[PDB]
Amino acid sequence: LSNKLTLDKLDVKGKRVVMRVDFNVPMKNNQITNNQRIKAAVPSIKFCLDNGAKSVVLMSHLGRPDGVPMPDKYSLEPVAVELKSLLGKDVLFLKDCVGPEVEKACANPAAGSVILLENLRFHVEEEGKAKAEPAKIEAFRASLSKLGDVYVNDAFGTAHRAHSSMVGVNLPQKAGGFLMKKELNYFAKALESPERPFLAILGGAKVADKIQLINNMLDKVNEMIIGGGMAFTFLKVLNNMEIGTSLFDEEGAKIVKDLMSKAEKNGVKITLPVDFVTADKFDENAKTGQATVASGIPAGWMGLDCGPESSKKYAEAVTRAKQIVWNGPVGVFEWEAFARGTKALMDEVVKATSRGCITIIGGGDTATCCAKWNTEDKVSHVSTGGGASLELLEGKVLPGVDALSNI
Ligand SMILES: Nc1ncnc2c1ncn2[C@@H]1O[C@H](COP(=O)(O)OP(=O)(O)O)[C@@H](O)[C@H]1O
Numbered sequence: 001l002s003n004k005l006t007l008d009k010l011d012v013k014g015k016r017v018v019m020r021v022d023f024n025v026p027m028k029n030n031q032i033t034n035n036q037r038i039k040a041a042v043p044s045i046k047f048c049l050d051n052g053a054k055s056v057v058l059m060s061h062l063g064r065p066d067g068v069p070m071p072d073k074y075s076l077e078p079v080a081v082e083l084k085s086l087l088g089k090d091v092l093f094l095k096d097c098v099g100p101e102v103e104k105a106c107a108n109p110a111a112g113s114v115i116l117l118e119n120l121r122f123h124v125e126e127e128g129k130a131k132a133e134p135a136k137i138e139a140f141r142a143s144l145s146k147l148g149d150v151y152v153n154d155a156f157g158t159a160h161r162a163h164s165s166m167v168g169v170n171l172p173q174k175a176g177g178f179l180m181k182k183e184l185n186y187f188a189k190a191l192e193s194p195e196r197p198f199l200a201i202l203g204g205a206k207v208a209d210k211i212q213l214i215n216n217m218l219d220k221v222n223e224m225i226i227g228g229g230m231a232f233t234f235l236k237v238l239n240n241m242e243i244g245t246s247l248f249d250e251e252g253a254k255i256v257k258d259l260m261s262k263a264e265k266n267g268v269k270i271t272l273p274v275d276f277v278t279a280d281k282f283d284e285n286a287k288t289g290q291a292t293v294a295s296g297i298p299a300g301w302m303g304l305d306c307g308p309e310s311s312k313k314y315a316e317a318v319t320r321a322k323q324i325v326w327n328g329p330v331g332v333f334e335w336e337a338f339a340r341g342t343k344a345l346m347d348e349v350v351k352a353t354s355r356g357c358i359t360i361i362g363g364g365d366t367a368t369c370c371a372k373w374n375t376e377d378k379v380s381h382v383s384t385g386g387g388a389s390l391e392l393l394e395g396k397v398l399p400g401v402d403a404l405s406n407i
Protein backbone atom coordinates (compact mmCIF):
# COMPACT_ATOMS: atom_id res chain seq x y z
CA LEU A 1 0.00 0.00 0.00
CA SER A 2 3.10 2.13 -0.32
CA ASN A 3 1.50 3.73 -3.40
CA LYS A 4 -2.00 3.89 -1.88
CA LEU A 5 -3.86 6.17 0.48
CA THR A 6 -4.27 4.52 3.87
CA LEU A 7 -6.36 5.46 6.88
CA ASP A 8 -3.45 6.86 8.88
CA LYS A 9 -3.33 9.70 6.26
CA LEU A 10 -7.10 10.08 5.78
CA ASP A 11 -8.56 13.20 7.45
CA VAL A 12 -11.80 11.87 9.01
CA LYS A 13 -12.70 14.83 11.24
CA GLY A 14 -16.37 15.72 10.66
CA LYS A 15 -16.49 13.22 7.79
CA ARG A 16 -18.97 10.43 7.29
CA VAL A 17 -16.90 7.27 6.63
CA VAL A 18 -18.36 4.47 4.54
CA MET A 19 -16.24 1.38 5.20
CA ARG A 20 -16.20 -1.99 3.48
CA VAL A 21 -15.32 -4.71 5.99
CA ASP A 22 -15.30 -8.51 5.78
CA PHE A 23 -17.90 -9.50 8.32
CA ASN A 24 -18.59 -12.82 6.49
CA VAL A 25 -18.29 -14.69 9.80
CA PRO A 26 -18.99 -18.38 10.18
CA MET A 27 -22.36 -19.35 11.62
CA LYS A 28 -23.85 -22.52 13.11
CA ASN A 29 -27.26 -22.85 14.70
CA ASN A 30 -27.72 -19.15 13.66
CA GLN A 31 -24.98 -18.12 16.13
CA ILE A 32 -21.59 -16.67 15.20
CA THR A 33 -18.91 -19.29 15.74
CA ASN A 34 -15.91 -17.00 15.39
CA ASN A 35 -15.84 -13.24 15.77
CA GLN A 36 -12.24 -13.04 14.46
CA ARG A 37 -13.20 -11.03 11.34
CA ILE A 38 -15.30 -8.54 13.33
CA LYS A 39 -12.62 -8.06 15.99
CA ALA A 40 -10.08 -7.56 13.18
CA ALA A 41 -11.89 -4.42 11.86
CA VAL A 42 -12.18 -2.76 15.28
CA PRO A 43 -8.86 -0.83 15.07
CA SER A 44 -9.91 1.01 11.84
CA ILE A 45 -13.41 1.66 13.25
CA LYS A 46 -12.11 2.96 16.59
CA PHE A 47 -9.55 5.07 14.78
CA CYS A 48 -12.26 6.81 12.74
CA LEU A 49 -14.37 7.52 15.83
CA ASP A 50 -11.37 8.62 17.89
CA ASN A 51 -10.28 11.06 15.20
CA GLY A 52 -13.67 12.71 14.88
CA ALA A 53 -15.62 10.87 12.20
CA LYS A 54 -19.23 12.00 12.10
CA SER A 55 -20.24 8.43 11.35
CA VAL A 56 -18.89 5.02 10.36
CA VAL A 57 -21.19 3.13 7.99
CA LEU A 58 -20.11 -0.51 7.79
CA MET A 59 -20.97 -2.74 4.86
CA SER A 60 -20.28 -6.41 4.13
CA HIS A 61 -21.62 -9.55 2.58
CA LEU A 62 -22.48 -12.70 4.47
CA GLY A 63 -22.33 -16.03 2.75
CA ARG A 64 -23.58 -16.41 -0.76
CA PRO A 65 -27.28 -15.47 -1.00
CA ASP A 66 -26.79 -14.93 -4.75
CA GLY A 67 -28.50 -11.54 -5.17
CA VAL A 68 -31.84 -12.17 -3.49
CA PRO A 69 -32.86 -11.02 -0.01
CA MET A 70 -32.42 -13.88 2.43
CA PRO A 71 -32.89 -12.26 5.88
CA ASP A 72 -33.98 -15.55 7.47
CA LYS A 73 -30.71 -17.18 6.40
CA TYR A 74 -27.96 -14.61 5.83
CA SER A 75 -28.77 -11.42 7.80
CA LEU A 76 -25.89 -9.39 9.26
CA GLU A 77 -28.03 -8.44 12.32
CA PRO A 78 -26.27 -10.92 14.69
CA VAL A 79 -22.99 -9.21 13.71
CA ALA A 80 -24.38 -5.82 14.82
CA VAL A 81 -24.94 -7.28 18.30
CA GLU A 82 -21.45 -8.80 18.45
CA LEU A 83 -19.79 -5.60 17.16
CA LYS A 84 -21.48 -3.54 19.96
CA SER A 85 -19.60 -5.49 22.65
CA LEU A 86 -16.27 -5.55 20.79
CA LEU A 87 -16.35 -1.80 20.06
CA GLY A 88 -17.67 -0.46 23.35
CA LYS A 89 -20.14 1.67 21.32
CA ASP A 90 -23.70 0.83 20.14
CA VAL A 91 -24.40 0.17 16.44
CA LEU A 92 -27.58 0.84 14.48
CA PHE A 93 -28.52 -1.96 12.11
CA LEU A 94 -30.34 -1.15 8.89
CA LYS A 95 -32.48 -3.77 7.06
CA ASP A 96 -31.11 -2.80 3.61
CA CYS A 97 -27.83 -1.36 2.23
CA VAL A 98 -29.36 1.05 -0.40
CA GLY A 99 -31.33 3.48 -1.22
CA PRO A 100 -34.17 5.81 -0.02
CA GLU A 101 -34.46 4.85 3.69
CA VAL A 102 -30.81 3.79 4.04
CA GLU A 103 -29.63 7.03 2.42
CA LYS A 104 -31.80 9.08 4.83
CA ALA A 105 -30.41 7.15 7.85
CA CYS A 106 -26.81 7.78 6.79
CA ALA A 107 -27.32 11.32 5.31
CA ASN A 108 -26.74 13.36 8.47
CA PRO A 109 -26.13 11.10 11.50
CA ALA A 110 -25.59 12.13 15.11
CA ALA A 111 -21.89 12.54 15.85
CA GLY A 112 -20.08 9.23 16.45
CA SER A 113 -22.86 7.08 14.94
CA VAL A 114 -21.87 3.55 13.95
CA ILE A 115 -24.16 2.00 11.34
CA LEU A 116 -24.12 -1.58 9.97
CA LEU A 117 -25.91 -2.13 6.68
CA GLU A 118 -27.64 -5.37 5.68
CA ASN A 119 -25.93 -8.07 3.55
CA LEU A 120 -24.74 -6.43 0.28
CA ARG A 121 -25.30 -9.70 -1.61
CA PHE A 122 -29.09 -9.47 -1.08
CA HIS A 123 -28.70 -7.29 -4.19
CA VAL A 124 -27.59 -8.83 -7.46
CA GLU A 125 -25.63 -5.62 -8.19
CA GLU A 126 -22.95 -6.35 -5.59
CA GLU A 127 -21.47 -9.42 -7.42
CA GLY A 128 -23.37 -8.50 -9.87
CA LYS A 129 -24.55 -11.84 -11.14
CA ALA A 130 -26.38 -14.55 -9.22
CA LYS A 131 -27.90 -11.33 -15.22
CA ALA A 132 -27.13 -8.02 -13.36
CA GLU A 133 -27.79 -4.98 -15.63
CA PRO A 134 -25.10 -2.28 -16.08
CA ALA A 135 -27.35 0.74 -15.37
CA LYS A 136 -28.49 -0.85 -12.09
CA ILE A 137 -24.92 -1.77 -11.06
CA GLU A 138 -24.11 1.92 -11.58
CA ALA A 139 -27.10 3.00 -9.47
CA PHE A 140 -26.19 0.52 -6.69
CA ARG A 141 -22.66 1.92 -6.59
CA ALA A 142 -23.97 5.51 -6.65
CA SER A 143 -26.23 4.69 -3.66
CA LEU A 144 -23.40 3.13 -1.58
CA SER A 145 -21.25 6.22 -2.43
CA LYS A 146 -23.85 8.57 -0.88
CA LEU A 147 -23.53 6.91 2.54
CA GLY A 148 -20.13 8.42 3.39
CA ASP A 149 -18.00 11.44 2.50
CA VAL A 150 -14.84 9.31 2.40
CA TYR A 151 -14.30 5.55 1.84
CA VAL A 152 -12.27 2.98 3.68
CA ASN A 153 -11.70 -0.59 2.62
CA ASP A 154 -10.67 -2.82 5.46
CA ALA A 155 -12.14 -5.98 3.95
CA PHE A 156 -8.98 -8.02 3.50
CA GLY A 157 -11.01 -11.21 3.41
CA THR A 158 -12.91 -10.03 0.38
CA ALA A 159 -10.08 -8.08 -1.33
CA HIS A 160 -9.89 -10.65 -4.16
CA ARG A 161 -13.43 -9.78 -5.16
CA ALA A 162 -14.00 -7.02 -7.71
CA HIS A 163 -17.51 -6.45 -6.39
CA SER A 164 -19.44 -3.21 -6.23
CA SER A 165 -18.74 -2.36 -2.61
CA MET A 166 -15.03 -3.23 -3.08
CA VAL A 167 -14.11 -1.48 -6.35
CA GLY A 168 -17.12 0.68 -7.28
CA VAL A 169 -17.46 3.35 -4.61
CA ASN A 170 -17.10 6.78 -6.19
CA LEU A 171 -15.73 9.13 -3.58
CA PRO A 172 -12.59 11.33 -3.87
CA GLN A 173 -10.68 9.57 -1.07
CA LYS A 174 -10.58 5.78 -0.98
CA ALA A 175 -8.21 4.54 1.77
CA GLY A 176 -6.95 1.15 2.84
CA GLY A 177 -7.68 0.36 6.43
CA PHE A 178 -5.32 -0.96 9.10
CA LEU A 179 -6.32 -4.65 8.73
CA MET A 180 -5.79 -4.41 5.01
CA LYS A 181 -2.37 -2.93 5.72
CA LYS A 182 -1.51 -5.50 8.45
CA GLU A 183 -2.38 -8.47 6.26
CA LEU A 184 -0.70 -7.17 3.09
CA ASN A 185 2.45 -6.32 5.05
CA TYR A 186 2.63 -9.73 6.67
CA PHE A 187 2.28 -11.52 3.37
CA ALA A 188 4.71 -9.21 1.55
CA LYS A 189 7.33 -10.16 4.07
CA ALA A 190 6.51 -13.88 4.21
CA LEU A 191 6.16 -14.36 0.40
CA GLU A 192 9.28 -12.38 -0.58
CA SER A 193 11.74 -15.23 -0.10
CA PRO A 194 9.83 -18.08 1.45
CA GLU A 195 11.55 -20.73 3.53
CA ARG A 196 11.83 -23.99 1.59
CA PRO A 197 10.32 -26.48 1.16
CA PHE A 198 7.26 -24.20 0.93
CA LEU A 199 4.09 -26.25 1.37
CA ALA A 200 0.60 -25.11 0.41
CA ILE A 201 -2.33 -26.95 2.00
CA LEU A 202 -5.56 -26.48 0.04
CA GLY A 203 -8.78 -27.90 1.42
CA GLY A 204 -12.26 -26.61 2.16
CA ALA A 205 -15.40 -26.37 0.07
CA LYS A 206 -15.01 -23.54 -2.45
CA VAL A 207 -13.83 -25.94 -5.11
CA ALA A 208 -14.92 -24.05 -8.27
CA ASP A 209 -13.06 -20.94 -7.13
CA LYS A 210 -10.00 -22.48 -5.50
CA ILE A 211 -9.16 -25.11 -8.11
CA GLN A 212 -8.55 -22.14 -10.49
CA LEU A 213 -5.81 -20.75 -8.20
CA ILE A 214 -3.67 -23.92 -8.33
CA ASN A 215 -2.06 -23.22 -11.71
CA ASN A 216 -0.25 -20.04 -10.60
CA MET A 217 0.43 -21.43 -7.06
CA LEU A 218 2.44 -24.24 -8.70
CA ASP A 219 5.06 -21.70 -9.71
CA LYS A 220 5.55 -20.63 -6.09
CA VAL A 221 5.45 -23.69 -3.86
CA ASN A 222 7.47 -26.89 -3.56
CA GLU A 223 4.67 -29.10 -2.26
CA MET A 224 0.90 -29.01 -2.20
CA ILE A 225 -1.59 -30.97 -0.17
CA ILE A 226 -4.92 -31.07 -1.93
CA GLY A 227 -7.48 -32.12 0.65
CA GLY A 228 -10.90 -31.48 2.01
CA GLY A 229 -13.59 -30.98 -0.56
CA MET A 230 -11.00 -30.18 -3.26
CA ALA A 231 -9.55 -33.69 -3.45
CA PHE A 232 -12.57 -35.45 -4.97
CA THR A 233 -12.36 -33.72 -8.35
CA PHE A 234 -8.69 -34.81 -8.62
CA LEU A 235 -9.36 -38.35 -7.44
CA LYS A 236 -12.27 -38.93 -9.83
CA VAL A 237 -10.17 -37.71 -12.80
CA LEU A 238 -6.76 -39.24 -11.91
CA ASN A 239 -7.86 -42.48 -10.25
CA ASN A 240 -11.30 -43.04 -11.72
CA MET A 241 -12.44 -43.17 -8.10
CA GLU A 242 -16.12 -43.39 -7.26
CA ILE A 243 -16.83 -40.32 -5.13
CA GLY A 244 -20.60 -40.61 -4.56
CA THR A 245 -22.15 -37.28 -3.64
CA SER A 246 -18.86 -35.71 -2.56
CA LEU A 247 -18.02 -32.19 -3.75
CA PHE A 248 -17.14 -32.20 -7.41
CA ASP A 249 -16.31 -29.39 -9.82
CA GLU A 250 -17.11 -30.14 -13.44
CA GLU A 251 -15.08 -27.22 -14.84
CA GLY A 252 -12.03 -27.88 -12.66
CA ALA A 253 -12.10 -31.58 -13.58
CA LYS A 254 -11.16 -30.47 -17.08
CA ILE A 255 -7.79 -29.02 -15.99
CA VAL A 256 -6.78 -31.63 -13.37
CA LYS A 257 -4.35 -33.52 -15.68
CA ASP A 258 -2.79 -30.26 -16.88
CA LEU A 259 -2.28 -29.19 -13.23
CA MET A 260 -0.65 -32.54 -12.38
CA SER A 261 1.57 -32.22 -15.46
CA LYS A 262 2.61 -28.75 -14.38
CA ALA A 263 3.32 -29.92 -10.84
CA GLU A 264 5.57 -32.63 -12.28
CA LYS A 265 7.32 -30.11 -14.56
CA ASN A 266 7.89 -27.78 -11.59
CA GLY A 267 8.98 -30.50 -9.10
CA VAL A 268 5.95 -29.86 -6.85
CA LYS A 269 5.04 -32.99 -4.85
CA ILE A 270 1.26 -33.35 -4.72
CA THR A 271 -0.22 -35.11 -1.66
CA LEU A 272 -3.84 -36.22 -2.17
CA PRO A 273 -5.76 -38.24 0.47
CA VAL A 274 -5.92 -42.04 0.18
CA ASP A 275 -8.74 -42.68 2.66
CA PHE A 276 -11.92 -41.05 3.97
CA VAL A 277 -14.62 -40.80 6.62
CA THR A 278 -17.89 -40.98 4.66
CA ALA A 279 -21.45 -39.85 5.45
CA ASP A 280 -24.88 -40.86 4.11
CA LYS A 281 -26.01 -37.22 3.88
CA PHE A 282 -24.72 -33.70 4.52
CA ASP A 283 -25.70 -33.71 8.19
CA GLU A 284 -24.02 -33.48 11.58
CA ASN A 285 -25.78 -36.73 12.51
CA ALA A 286 -25.30 -38.63 9.26
CA LYS A 287 -24.50 -42.33 9.45
CA THR A 288 -20.79 -42.69 8.84
CA GLY A 289 -18.41 -45.08 7.13
CA GLN A 290 -14.88 -45.56 5.84
CA ALA A 291 -13.49 -45.63 2.31
CA THR A 292 -10.16 -45.74 0.58
CA VAL A 293 -9.29 -44.59 -2.96
CA ALA A 294 -9.24 -48.28 -3.99
CA SER A 295 -12.66 -49.06 -2.47
CA GLY A 296 -14.31 -45.90 -3.77
CA ILE A 297 -17.11 -44.11 -1.93
CA PRO A 298 -20.52 -45.81 -2.22
CA ALA A 299 -23.39 -44.34 -4.30
CA GLY A 300 -25.23 -41.66 -2.29
CA TRP A 301 -22.44 -41.20 0.30
CA MET A 302 -19.96 -38.35 0.52
CA GLY A 303 -16.44 -38.09 1.90
CA LEU A 304 -16.48 -35.51 4.69
CA ASP A 305 -13.06 -36.15 6.26
CA CYS A 306 -9.82 -37.82 5.29
CA GLY A 307 -8.82 -41.02 7.08
CA PRO A 308 -5.74 -42.03 9.09
CA GLU A 309 -3.54 -43.01 6.13
CA SER A 310 -4.16 -39.56 4.59
CA SER A 311 -3.37 -37.86 7.88
CA LYS A 312 -0.03 -39.70 7.95
CA LYS A 313 0.83 -38.49 4.42
CA TYR A 314 -0.24 -34.96 5.33
CA ALA A 315 1.97 -35.18 8.45
CA GLU A 316 4.87 -36.27 6.24
CA ALA A 317 4.55 -33.16 4.06
CA VAL A 318 4.30 -30.90 7.12
CA THR A 319 7.45 -32.49 8.59
CA ARG A 320 9.36 -31.58 5.38
CA ALA A 321 8.06 -27.97 5.29
CA LYS A 322 10.00 -24.94 6.40
CA GLN A 323 7.04 -22.72 5.43
CA ILE A 324 3.30 -23.52 5.16
CA VAL A 325 0.27 -21.60 3.89
CA TRP A 326 -2.93 -23.45 4.78
CA ASN A 327 -6.34 -22.50 3.47
CA GLY A 328 -9.26 -24.89 3.89
CA PRO A 329 -10.02 -27.56 6.47
CA VAL A 330 -9.36 -31.14 5.34
CA GLY A 331 -12.82 -32.25 6.51
CA VAL A 332 -16.09 -30.84 7.87
CA PHE A 333 -14.41 -29.90 11.14
CA GLU A 334 -17.53 -28.16 12.44
CA TRP A 335 -19.09 -31.58 12.96
CA GLU A 336 -17.28 -33.82 15.40
CA ALA A 337 -17.74 -36.92 13.31
CA PHE A 338 -15.66 -35.29 10.56
CA ALA A 339 -13.16 -33.22 12.57
CA ARG A 340 -10.32 -35.72 13.21
CA GLY A 341 -8.32 -35.13 9.98
CA THR A 342 -8.31 -31.37 10.51
CA LYS A 343 -7.41 -31.71 14.20
CA ALA A 344 -4.57 -34.09 13.40
CA LEU A 345 -3.26 -31.74 10.72
CA MET A 346 -3.56 -28.80 13.11
CA ASP A 347 -1.57 -30.79 15.72
CA GLU A 348 1.18 -31.31 13.10
CA VAL A 349 1.21 -27.64 12.00
CA VAL A 350 1.54 -26.57 15.63
CA LYS A 351 4.39 -29.10 16.10
CA ALA A 352 6.02 -27.67 12.99
CA THR A 353 5.79 -24.10 14.27
CA SER A 354 7.51 -25.22 17.48
CA ARG A 355 10.64 -26.41 15.62
CA GLY A 356 10.91 -23.27 13.42
CA CYS A 357 8.39 -23.73 10.59
CA ILE A 358 6.74 -20.50 9.39
CA THR A 359 3.05 -21.49 9.51
CA ILE A 360 0.31 -19.31 8.01
CA ILE A 361 -3.31 -20.28 8.42
CA GLY A 362 -5.96 -18.26 6.57
CA GLY A 363 -9.71 -18.14 5.97
CA GLY A 364 -13.02 -17.45 7.66
CA ASP A 365 -13.51 -21.18 8.29
CA THR A 366 -9.88 -22.31 8.56
CA ALA A 367 -9.08 -19.64 11.17
CA THR A 368 -12.05 -21.03 13.10
CA CYS A 369 -10.09 -24.31 13.39
CA CYS A 370 -7.50 -22.28 15.25
CA ALA A 371 -10.18 -20.82 17.50
CA LYS A 372 -11.78 -24.27 18.14
CA TRP A 373 -8.54 -25.98 19.15
CA ASN A 374 -6.99 -22.93 20.76
CA THR A 375 -4.04 -22.66 18.38
CA GLU A 376 -4.27 -19.00 17.30
CA ASP A 377 -1.03 -18.23 19.23
CA LYS A 378 0.59 -21.57 18.33
CA VAL A 379 1.08 -20.86 14.60
CA SER A 380 3.04 -18.02 12.97
CA HIS A 381 0.06 -16.08 11.52
CA VAL A 382 -3.67 -16.48 11.35
CA SER A 383 -5.12 -14.50 8.49
CA THR A 384 -8.63 -13.20 8.03
CA GLY A 385 -8.21 -13.97 4.30
CA GLY A 386 -8.53 -17.41 2.72
CA GLY A 387 -8.99 -17.10 -1.05
CA ALA A 388 -7.61 -13.53 -0.68
CA SER A 389 -4.40 -14.96 0.79
CA LEU A 390 -4.11 -17.63 -1.89
CA GLU A 391 -4.38 -14.87 -4.54
CA LEU A 392 -1.42 -13.05 -2.86
CA LEU A 393 0.39 -16.40 -2.92
CA GLU A 394 -0.21 -16.50 -6.75
CA GLY A 395 1.50 -13.09 -6.97
CA LYS A 396 -1.59 -11.05 -7.81
CA VAL A 397 -2.61 -7.55 -6.83
CA LEU A 398 -5.99 -7.79 -5.15
CA PRO A 399 -8.80 -5.77 -6.78
CA GLY A 400 -9.87 -4.27 -3.46
CA VAL A 401 -6.38 -2.85 -2.99
CA ASP A 402 -5.96 -1.79 -6.66
CA ALA A 403 -9.19 0.30 -6.43
CA LEU A 404 -7.82 2.42 -3.56
CA SER A 405 -6.67 6.02 -4.20
CA ASN A 406 -3.01 6.43 -5.22
CA ILE A 407 -0.94 8.75 -3.02
N1 LIG B 1 -14.80 -33.08 2.21
C1 LIG B 1 -15.55 -31.98 2.40
N2 LIG B 1 -16.79 -31.86 1.88
C2 LIG B 1 -17.57 -30.76 2.09
N3 LIG B 1 -17.13 -29.68 2.76
C3 LIG B 1 -15.88 -29.70 3.30
C4 LIG B 1 -14.99 -30.85 3.12
N4 LIG B 1 -13.81 -30.57 3.75
C5 LIG B 1 -13.95 -29.33 4.25
N5 LIG B 1 -15.17 -28.84 4.01
C6 LIG B 1 -15.73 -27.53 4.39
O1 LIG B 1 -14.95 -26.46 3.86
C7 LIG B 1 -15.47 -25.33 4.51
C8 LIG B 1 -14.53 -24.15 4.46
O2 LIG B 1 -14.03 -24.01 3.15
P1 LIG B 1 -13.61 -22.51 2.66
O3 LIG B 1 -14.79 -21.58 2.79
O4 LIG B 1 -12.96 -22.73 1.30
O5 LIG B 1 -12.47 -22.17 3.67
P2 LIG B 1 -12.15 -20.70 4.29
O6 LIG B 1 -13.21 -20.00 5.02
O7 LIG B 1 -11.05 -21.05 5.20
O8 LIG B 1 -11.46 -20.01 3.10
C9 LIG B 1 -15.70 -25.78 5.96
O9 LIG B 1 -16.93 -25.18 6.30
C10 LIG B 1 -15.76 -27.29 5.90
O10 LIG B 1 -16.98 -27.80 6.50
Ligand code: BEF
Pocket residue numbers: 157206362363364365384385386387388
Ligand atom coordinates in the same frame (compact mmCIF):
# COMPACT_ATOMS: atom_id res chain seq x y z
F1 BEF C 1 -14.29 -18.82 2.61
BE1 BEF C 1 -12.96 -17.68 2.39
F2 BEF C 1 -11.83 -18.15 1.11
F3 BEF C 1 -12.15 -17.15 3.85
Ligand SMILES: [Cl-]
Pocket residue numbers: 205206207208209210
Ligand atom coordinates in the same frame (compact mmCIF):
# COMPACT_ATOMS: atom_id res chain seq x y z
CL1 LIG D 1 -16.54 -21.87 -5.11
Ligand SMILES: [Mg+2]
Pocket residue numbers: 363364365366386
Ligand atom coordinates in the same frame (compact mmCIF):
# COMPACT_ATOMS: atom_id res chain seq x y z
MG1 LIG E 1 -14.74 -20.18 4.08
